[PDB]
Amino acid sequence: MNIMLTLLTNVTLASLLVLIAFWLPQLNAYSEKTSPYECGFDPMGSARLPFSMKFFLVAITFLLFDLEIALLLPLPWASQTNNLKTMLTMALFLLILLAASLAYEWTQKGLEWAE
Amino acid sequence: MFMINILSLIIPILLAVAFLTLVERKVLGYMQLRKGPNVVGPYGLLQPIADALKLFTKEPLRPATSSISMFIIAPILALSLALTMWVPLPMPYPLINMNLGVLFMLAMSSLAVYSILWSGWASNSKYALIGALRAVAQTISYEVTLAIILLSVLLMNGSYTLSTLITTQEHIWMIFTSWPLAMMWFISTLAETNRAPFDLTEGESELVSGFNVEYAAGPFAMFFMAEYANIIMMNAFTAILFLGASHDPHTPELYTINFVLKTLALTITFLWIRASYPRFRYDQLMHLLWKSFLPLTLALCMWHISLPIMTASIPPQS
Amino acid sequence: SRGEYVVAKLDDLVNWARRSSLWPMTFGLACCAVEMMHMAAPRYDMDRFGVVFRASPRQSDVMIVAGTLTNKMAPALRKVYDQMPEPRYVVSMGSCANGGGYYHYSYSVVRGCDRIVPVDIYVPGCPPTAEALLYGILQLQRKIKREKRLRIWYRR
Amino acid sequence: ELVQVLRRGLQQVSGHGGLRGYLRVLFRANDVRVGTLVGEDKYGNKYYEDNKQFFGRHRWVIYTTEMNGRDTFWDVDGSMVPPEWHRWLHCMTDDP
Amino acid sequence: TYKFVNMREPSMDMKSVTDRAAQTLLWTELVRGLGMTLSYLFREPATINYPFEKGPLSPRFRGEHALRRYPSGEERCIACKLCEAVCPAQAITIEAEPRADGSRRTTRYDIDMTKCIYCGFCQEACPVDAIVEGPNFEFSTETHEELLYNKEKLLNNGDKWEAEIAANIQADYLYR
Amino acid sequence: FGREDRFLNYFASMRWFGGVPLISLGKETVKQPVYIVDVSKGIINAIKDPDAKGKTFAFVGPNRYLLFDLVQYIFAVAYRPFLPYPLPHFAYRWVGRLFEVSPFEPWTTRDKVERVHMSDMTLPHLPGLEDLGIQATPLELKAIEVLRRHRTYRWLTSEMEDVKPAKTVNI
Amino acid sequence: MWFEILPGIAVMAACLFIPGMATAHIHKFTNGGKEKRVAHFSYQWNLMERDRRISGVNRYHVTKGLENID
Amino acid sequence: HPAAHGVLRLVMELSGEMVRKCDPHIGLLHRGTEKLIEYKTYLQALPYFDRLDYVSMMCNEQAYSLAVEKLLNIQPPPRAQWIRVLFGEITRLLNHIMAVTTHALDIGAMTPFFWMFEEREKMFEFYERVSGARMHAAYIRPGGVHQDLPLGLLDDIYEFSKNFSFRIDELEEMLTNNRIWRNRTVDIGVVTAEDALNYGFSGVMLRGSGIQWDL
């Protein structure tokens, strides 16, 4: 109840700031003013053209490495178990596999960007 | 009465943010053998008010090629999230007490980057697109390392409750136990706030203005205050995490003063770092975070899992 | 009347805010821009007056034309002047900008930037000293202080 | 040495004719130093010197509040200096 | 004779290797840079309080133009047109005729300040010290037309700045 | 009509209210708009012409349009969906009076609603632009330079000869 | 100055003083002046609900001592 | 653009952020100086060379003066030549300060610019004291220099020179051994000696590749 009210208050303040920004000052909008900016000149092509990503492999690896965080965050509660040996073994095993995956991608030139 | 507390949180934060810009300008000026703003009001104390009044009486423009809905949405989301990040911070009592405060701040910080992405894409300009892609690369660079550092540091706290960090550091600062991670953590915050040497999403010397190149007047001002509020919030979170202030239940003002002083020191350190160093290349930041920070972070995560079990020092409150 | 007093006070507030926060575009052409660099250098420190360079035209208030404007460059200068949100001002600095100067009779030089954009202040010199340009900036501040937009609107 | 600099600040406050003069000079020039008076204009500008400052800050002018026809309490400019004090103020000579 | 800027090798002993590893892991040179900026923080800034303080100039400084007079009040200019001939920017326009008393004086003397390059060649060419570049530099205008000086404007500038101009010429004329 | 006019921009901006209100669906109004450059050149030529001293001129465009067709063409050039509906005269007058209360420049007025819905007069006895050596510019040649500003990003690059010149009631 | 940077910093500090302090005072004003109760788990919430039920005024912070056991 | 020096239109073909093609478009500051010189006398044509390379003014003056003196078959007096070399080295200091500090500004190091432009201002004071103009001196002319040094100028030049080394040291502290600066500058824009010779390079652009040449 309090969190919803706080979120609503913050969003309302930001929206009111936008409304004041757009309704208080004097607007003189013409074609040349609202054109795109390319530092002196009209752009040759569109900005919606494909834009190559040289770190795509790292981007895919980030998806798999992010779920390791999901698997690892319950560790503070897992440390309160009675069979600490099994829990420590499993946590170390998971981290060792994460490090091994990182090492495998590193040695196979997977962290280098495309040319 | 709860709305009174919400306002008493949000308004001083904005006021602090406005004055932060003045402090940032004067500190850089004096480290550059000049003075910075000293004309508009005594010691430049009226400069932020003049800046805000100028920005909000200036005409905002809608780019012809822009997508208007996302263009208006992005600054609103940025400012609202920057304000929302402050509610779980215990100083020494939080406005919102959460069992999982750290995870909430993590998720909100993760959502905050979409303001940059959507503004850059909806501007429909080339430099804005380059800035948005640099933001994508930056998040990919720092996210995993930052999260694992948080987990390793909080393994000695016992939970994800932020206020418990006050109890964990009753006698000694957590930095004295985790100064390696702390160092890495600090750099990650620099990467998380898009601050020098990692101010790539803006990149003034390379991308003119980056993602916000098409923004003017009020939306640009909102992006600015969101960024500075994020700076202050991250430094406050770092101060609570690693520099534990002593809290006396019958006099919380002492904790408030100590916390504010430590936060100010860390923010001034950010300004100093901006004043001192050149700028990274945005592939070099990825290589730094993935080839140096990630292996050390993994090893120290193993170490900080093993240490409480080795020394029989597991914290309470499962 | 009360309305006249209120609009006068609001004019004062807006004029003070606009002249106390002047953000010139990062825009220079020739030798004169070098003196502009000396106007931001620690000796003069234009930032202490609230004057900050910003690269984006959308986030700039003043255009300082520091250098020779050529025919090849005129459409670009006009374009980045038009993309500046209003209210906006133009400061013409140096002889070339003011009237062509040493290259007035050239086949490729615009004889003064006022043929392309309206000009508020003209700063003479080849180049004007950093102090001369600072004097021009303060004169522009005074000219802004003399503005009466809301009074004019009220008397309409 | 902290007490010395605080006493110097108090001396600067007191040497401007009290608190009101201190605030007047602070809001008219953003500067509160005290220097040896060199001379005054027929228009009311006062000229002060302090040889212990570094080159550029060792000579300064407090402008008048009323020149020929306008009020210069806030609107001052460097064109209000007469040619003789212009030569002195710009260090083209060492003689007032 | 020459020297090498980047031809030094690092020693491979355990002392130097451990020092370099400590430099890598604990960021010592970055702390050195921070210390340099912190040292600059506590220094006295070089900013002056313009317009209440001014940057230093010289008697040779070339500022706004002025037309001068003899101590009797007679104009020094004799319409020889040397300044017009020497002007690299063709900023000077002169027309002359005999005065009512038969004296060689100008009727038109214009200087286009937006054509002027402020080189000082005109006062070098003048044989009677009639035209000079004065000490003034704070004469910005609001319209272009105000920077197109005629004879009256330049004579007024001379009458207004003669006290400083004569002193500067007295201080500088033995080098010319 | 021109870049800074209140004629094409007025109808183009009326898209912000969803539907286009037209008295009698704009089927009983005829308009003969004229280009801005044509009017300015006519003024200049009247200044320079010696026989135009005490004359009275009527500056009109080459074509006459029914208001409905003109507004439909305006929306077509702007590539905006045209949703015309009829509004009673009293209701539109009430709307104009409601908009008249703005202390700033009114969005519309009762006088504007009146003037929009009157047929342009025909005065063949008066000299026109052709008597000052000017050939009147058709609306179909200059409508894009005003209405391209009102398009979305998807239609900004559409050519001028794309949008099917409107039908004219020319005598 | 360098001490001329201090005023703005001071203002900053003042602003950052307000939120936390405010929260503390508000917590004392709406909870009987005794440091608003924390309920992280179900047991503490059950204690709070029992206190609210037995207070007699539908407010958990109204505490009844041994004077209520006749 | 902040990094385009105002009048450069670099048309770049990029694949992502990888630069596939650079096409420099110049002439945005083409003023037709060479055609304008043909209507001026030699003295009248001298001040154009001040505005050619407006970071190194007296060096262009000296080059033009040397060319005209060679064509005239005359010799400047020795004191004029010594003054020329002194002010040429002062001009070299100005040019290298501007180059290094703006380079660091483009990379991202903005602080050394402000430290070194105070020294640049002091050298501008030297220029003004010798000629009356801060940058466009027109001091060096075919046959020597226009005016002799005012009394006390050499002492002030000595005072500046005995302290400038510490400013160089502070800049070197901030940049030389920093790992970020090295990561941004090492192995960037590598050019071979033969390519540098064939492409028409000169100055540091040659000497950085090991070519031992200096005019």
Ligand SMILES: CCCCCCCCCCCCCCCCC[C@@H](O)O[C@H](CO[C@H](O)CCCCCCCCCCCCCCC)COP(=O)(O)OCC[N+](C)(C)C
């Ligand atoms: C800091 C955070 C909290 C802020 C709290 C205040 C929030 C304010 C929100 C922003 C509004 C202030 C900005 C401007 C003042 C309001 C006027 C404007 O917004 O609306 C006008 C409203 O006008 C409308 O177009 C038509 C006028 C009447 C509308 C009909 C509604 C019913 C009125 C019938 C009369 C009877 C009185 C009804 C009231 C009881 C349109 O003006 P417009 O020209 O477009 O835009 C240019 C604005 N200029 C002139 C200031 C430069």
Ligand SMILES: CCCCCCCCCCCCCCCCC[C@@H](O)O[C@H](CO[C@H](O)CCCCCCCCCCCCCCC)COP(=O)(O)OCC[N+](C)(C)C
């Ligand atoms: C509350 C939230 C909504 C509103 C947000 C605004 C918050 C309040 C704004 C604070 C205003 C303070 C500005 C006043 C500073 C002026 C200082 C003084 O110098 O001004 C002089 C004269 O003052 C100005 O003429 C008038 C400025 C103030 C205007 C009147 C006050 C109006 C207040 C109305 C508030 C209503 C807000 C909106 C309510 C919805 C001009 O001097 P100047 O030439 O520069 O300096 C020369 C420089 N030298 C000295 C170095 C040589």
Ligand SMILES: CCCCCCCC/C=C\CCCCCCCC(=O)O[C@H](COC(=O)CCCCCCC/C=C/CCCCCCCC)COP(=O)(O)OCCN
């Ligand atoms: C008995 C068993 C005990 C357990 C073992 C514990 C011992 C641990 C010892 C090692 C700890 C090392 C911690 C450092 C973590 C990362 C450091 C690092 O090596 O990274 C650097 C890079 O780090 C940086 O250079 C940082 C760049 C950005 C600098 C930003 C500003 C500098 C920081 C200012 C001060 C920081 C203050 C931190 C604390 C703040 C308060 C919380 C390597 O990069 P390169 O030199 O390029 O070489 C890579 C190829 N080999």
Ligand SMILES: CCCCCCCCCCC1=C(C)C(=O)C(OC)=C(OC)C1=O
């Ligand atoms: C923040 C430090 C001050 C920067 C001043 C920006 C001046 C913008 C002018 C552009 C420009 C730059 C950058 C520049 O570097 C340069 O030298 C080659 C010019 O020629 C004079 C220029 O015109």
Ligand code: SF4
């Ligand atoms: S006016 Fe003189 S200094 Fe300025 S750009 Fe032109 S030639 Fe260079």
Ligand code: SF4
């Ligand atoms: S200073 Fe040079 S350009 Fe100016 S008028 Fe004299 S000779 Fe001509």
Ligand code: SF4
């Ligand atoms: S100013 Fe001197 S050089 Fe020029 S015409 Fe007069 S006397 Fe001759």
